[PDB]
Ligand binder design. Structure first.
Ligand SMILES: [Mg+2]
Ligand SMILES: [Mg+2]
Ligand SMILES: [Mg+2]
Ligand SMILES: [Mg+2]
Ligand SMILES: [Mg+2]
Ligand SMILES: [Mg+2]
Ligand SMILES: [Mg+2]
Ligand SMILES: [Mg+2]
Lengths: 386, 386, 386, 386
């Protein structure tokens, strides 16, 4: 059985299964969903919780009276189901006012409203229990080269994040922020386009420890990059506070496909890394069930997300448990890459003649890497052909 | 006249015009070049200096006797011509021993030799006058997911860089390091794949002030990204210690085309940024004159690099000098993006009702950005159609 | 003053200037437009005419009576402004019924509703005077491998285009069909993804003379292909019945930027080929005025498209008439490419010893191609630097 | 034990296992191989045969006498191992003389040397028993816009393929031609960039029955295209004369990875289509054993290719025979896609009111497609989880 138990820590966004199918060239094919219904039906599927946008839970223009009730209805649903809200975020992209940006919009009033919209939802995620607030600067970018000065916009993004962290520190909320990076769509080019680009911005902030990254599979495969390597660098820096799982079939529009689909081998490697690294955070799914589907094909696609990750857990664990693989990893000197290069020091490395004058480049170049053998061992494990 | 004077600070690599035309599917079409000849012929073209690889100046396997003379011949050429050597680097990719890596190779002896090869050329760049040493980890990557643990390899890259900075600090060399980032080719995926990815690694080093980035146009256009935005973030962090200029015609093999070719509009924006920012460093050209050309088409392609940048200097300066553009930039509230969002503070932003309750999202959303007008003003300036 | 006149045959879509700004992450930012408004304003901007989808002119569900009023309004505007309707097409993508395809939908009733919607608007184009009917299978395609047997779907695409030629041939209309190819978006992979792919599909039709291509610049650049080259092969086959001009900044989503932006050099080589071949057809812009813009920005974008085209007409003509260029071309032996390779015959080539035995292969290979000097001449002719 | 036998018709290139590791940034890492060595070793690995370039078997410049000895050696090996030579091709890319193209080179003497080199090796293939001759115009293309008039170059490609069909038709050989399309590398843009582009070129030939396609998986995936779809259109046109199996990790350089790697799901859908269509031709691997590997790694890569294929043969067959899948397909109405859209005729469809007036468009659009349940059934059939 590859069934999900809330111990698997699988989370979905209200907007995932809720996607009504309105694409750029077509209209909606599915009706709108209730947040309460989604929490309930996602619970019988084995999920651990749900994440949300402000605009997903509280309609825009809603009075405070309507707001409190939309929340009370949602909390009674989470309480009665057992669901969690590990993460929250702000729609700072859908409304026409967020056309040129939110935090980096050329118009100051817009910037100032984006901050107020976000601070309000931060307050909500605090009382609901969320430990991470994600930010996706989807509109923070341009289609022309003189419409935004990146240098000056990175100043307005720093300000906003450092203001949002001055509020969390003042309030005493147990929240840490996570930047979701995308290279294009909805804007032509987005600011902070990669995991590395956001990881750098963080170290230029005032309280860099409150900020981290929320990487998405297809957001990096949209740029031709290896998401597992990106997760590795963010792990290597301690800045994987959240992750978004899905599928992407090339360098094209953001498909937001179910996990496992797209590049299957890269999903095998992703599960290998997270499980070797001990990722104890939410495994969040940001997929858009295709507009050709109905509500039954919506829940089927959310169960496949969970089933596919679980099948990969079993295949990636069986792969590292295999003595044949463990011997092949040793054949490929992966054990010797964890050995420090110059623990003797620079002075003693500079006196090693065996590291230069008495080194046989030619014997060493003749040494094969045995990488092809290790890789077919992986493919047969992924396939269950062992 | 769009002629280059050594005040333009144009530099080329010995390997650029020296490229003999050996591609993956074909053999060389051009003969090898002498370093001395290249310095001389690049000097009559108006260049300011030349950069070099160890293996470009000193053949591999060369005795110390041969080495000193290859250098003495090169220095007499630079002295007699007036050429500069602003930057140097190490071939840690061509030799078969660097197949799986140099600094992050699974085999420790290889790692230890890569360091010794680099420390030797560092010494040379010191005495020659170079102020930047560039590192291109072209082989630091994989084609399979179990052949390299990125987390452990980033540990071996940190060690090597922190060892190379322990040597520069001990020797007292006026050198700062620059990481050249590439996403793929020669390996399937390379470690530190973007400018952001390298900018992050730097802030995880022990002496982060000695390290910076050397971005290349086509290395970022290979990933679908906007090189001007990348230069902006690196500028915004003070970590543009060097730059590599060329052309790339899409997400494909590294074409290393002349500057101006490829995405011409992005080269207009690149020159705009560097000149607005006051880049006072070397404008280095990393182009491979096509293998269909002869030595006369080699020097023509190096003169076009310089001519194209100069034509763009004149068009980007005329664009920002135009009152019509200056009015359009004000129409697009680019002046208002340099205004801080909440200089009144968080407390006063939280008390501004005009930033939330009394804000007319609808009037603000109705406001157009006038970005299309500013952009045609740029296109007509680039074209000289004003 | 590169100013357009109706004699330039610049057309436009009603959905181009009409785009309201709705993208997959954002609501509409602009109001809907009345076709009579579009006709009149683009007639003051120098256009030759407009084009349309069925549901752009007659709202979906409209009764016959409402239908005829909408046409009569439109026609009154055309006749008053002198603007013609050179091409028509059908919306087979916006409605949910089309979510798995129109002619290739897995359900037969939808495939029949498509042809009928279509034939209904082919009559209308015959009345309005259109000479080309364009078809774009944006919904013909898939995101999954067992959702569409492409081979069976092509039999359904053949059936439809062949039923559509039987109807035109029976009613005696002076209309020809053109296929707009696109590689992806809205579907994961779209059937007939390139200009070539549909050139081949056309040859498998019963009446292959009624069918050509509507290439769109951005569509080929979403697969990393050379648009001038593909147009060359449609010009060679004789199947360039219509052209759709826009702009694209690489392999991403269909940005539908205004013509000239994206890759200026590609636009430079398209206007060369188009004007050296005598494309007497309509120069059609299928752009999307960016959602950051108001209606004044919108009309400024349509102006840019036509201005940008006419500048390139001025610089490609000057290029091909430059005596320096006409000498560079003879040096690159582009005159000899026009000489038949073997006008003497097979038996004569096989008897020739100068084509094998006595051919000096090392001399031919030492001859340069002089391609870089030619290209710098074209770069300076594009930028007004000659 | 998914173990290959010659009855599986798995062929190989001599340049595949022969690759020495030379890439554009690196020297050779492996020694050259003797064709007799390759024939024998791949005969112990379960292959049906090998393929070859002219210069892979007869060194360039070889005298007729040296020529005949090389053939006789090779043939002795073939006859001893039972391994056949199913396809031959010509190297028209490695020598400098081919740097601007072979059949489309701007110089006529090179265009004639090409056809003669070629015809020389077409004789050889007729002797060795080959039934397909493949042509790959890796050098036919350009990096500049005025270096090649594509329309005139296509007239030179037509001339050549038509002179080549006149020679085969005169000598009575049981050989057919196949075009290997590739989008880029070694040239900036290669002519006939896709499967479709050459399907159309073939139709413009005098004897269009002697010409099919040699699609390569990685070549289409270097343009972001679906290889199973393109093969479907070659199977539909009847022009799939040969297939080249490898692996590719997205839009980058031709990695020529071993089959199975890159996108496993694409390989899963290719083996489905190939085995459901009855492709009786040779299953040819055009991979490049990575330069990180020794000769034992090399032979392990050829084994992987054939093993990976046979596993997919096991899982696509089980998929299409699963009774659960055969019910999912009927639910996705893939049976109705096989029903003609309008077997009743045009006049009967136009009389039908149930195809317009009385069609319930909102019901059809509310019906789901059940595409996600089908695909999870194919994901679990691929991974052995059903
Ligand atoms: Mg997404
Ligand atoms: Mg997300
Ligand atoms: Mg480069
Ligand atoms: Mg470089
Ligand atoms: Mg388009
Ligand atoms: Mg179009
Ligand atoms: Mg290949
Ligand atoms: Mg091949």
């Amino acid at each position: 059985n590859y069934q999900p138990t809330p111990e698997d820590r699988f989370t979905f966004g209200l907007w995932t299964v809720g996607w009504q199918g309105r694409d750029p060239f077509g209209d909606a094919t599915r009706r709108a969903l209730d947040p309460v219904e989604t929490v309930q039906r996602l619970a019988g599927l084995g999920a651990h919780g749900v994440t949300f946008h402000d605009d997903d839970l509280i309609p825009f223009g809603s009075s405070d009276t309507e707001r409190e009730s939309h929340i009370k209805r949602f909390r009674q649903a989470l309480d009665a189901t057992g669901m969690a809200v590990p993460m929250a975020t702000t729609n700072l992209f859908t409304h026409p006012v967020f056309k040129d940006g939110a935090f980096t919009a050329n118009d100051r009033d817009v910037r100032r409203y984006a901050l107020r919209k976000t601070i309000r939802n931060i307050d909500l995620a605090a009382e609901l229990g969320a430990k991470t607030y994600v930010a996706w600067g989807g509109r923070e970018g341009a289609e022309s080269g003189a419409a935004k000065d990146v240098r000056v916009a990175l100043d307005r993004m720093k300000e906003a994040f450092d203001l949002l962290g001055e509020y969390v520190t003042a309030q005493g909320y147990d929240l840490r922020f996570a930047i979701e990076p995308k290279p294009n769509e909805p804007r032509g080019d987005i600011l902070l386009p990669t995991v590395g680009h956001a990881l750098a911005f963080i170290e230029r902030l005032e309280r860099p420890e409150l900020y981290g990254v929320n990487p998405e599979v297809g957001h990096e495969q949209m740029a031709g990059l290896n998401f597992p390597h990106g997760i590795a660098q963010a792990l290597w820096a301690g800045k994987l506070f959240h992750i978004d799982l899905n599928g992407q079939s090339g360098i094209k529009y953001d498909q937001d496909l179910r996990f496992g689909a797209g590049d299957l081998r890269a999903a095998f490697w992703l599960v290998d890394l997270l499980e070797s690294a001990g990722y104890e955070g939410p495994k969040h799914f940001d997929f858009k069930p295709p507009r050709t589907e109905d509500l039954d094909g919506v829940w089927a696609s959310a169960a496949g997300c969970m089933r596919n990750y679980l099948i990969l857990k079993e295949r990636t664990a069986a792969f590292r448990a295999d003595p044949e693989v463990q011997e092949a990893l040793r054949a490929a000197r992966l054990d010797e890459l964890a050995q420090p290069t110059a623990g003797d020091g620079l002075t003693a490395l500079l006196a090693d003649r065996t590291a230069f004058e008495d080194f046989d480049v030619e014997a060493a170049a003749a040494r094969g890497m045995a990488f092809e053998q290790l890789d077919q061992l992986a493919m047969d494990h992924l396939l269950g052909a062992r």
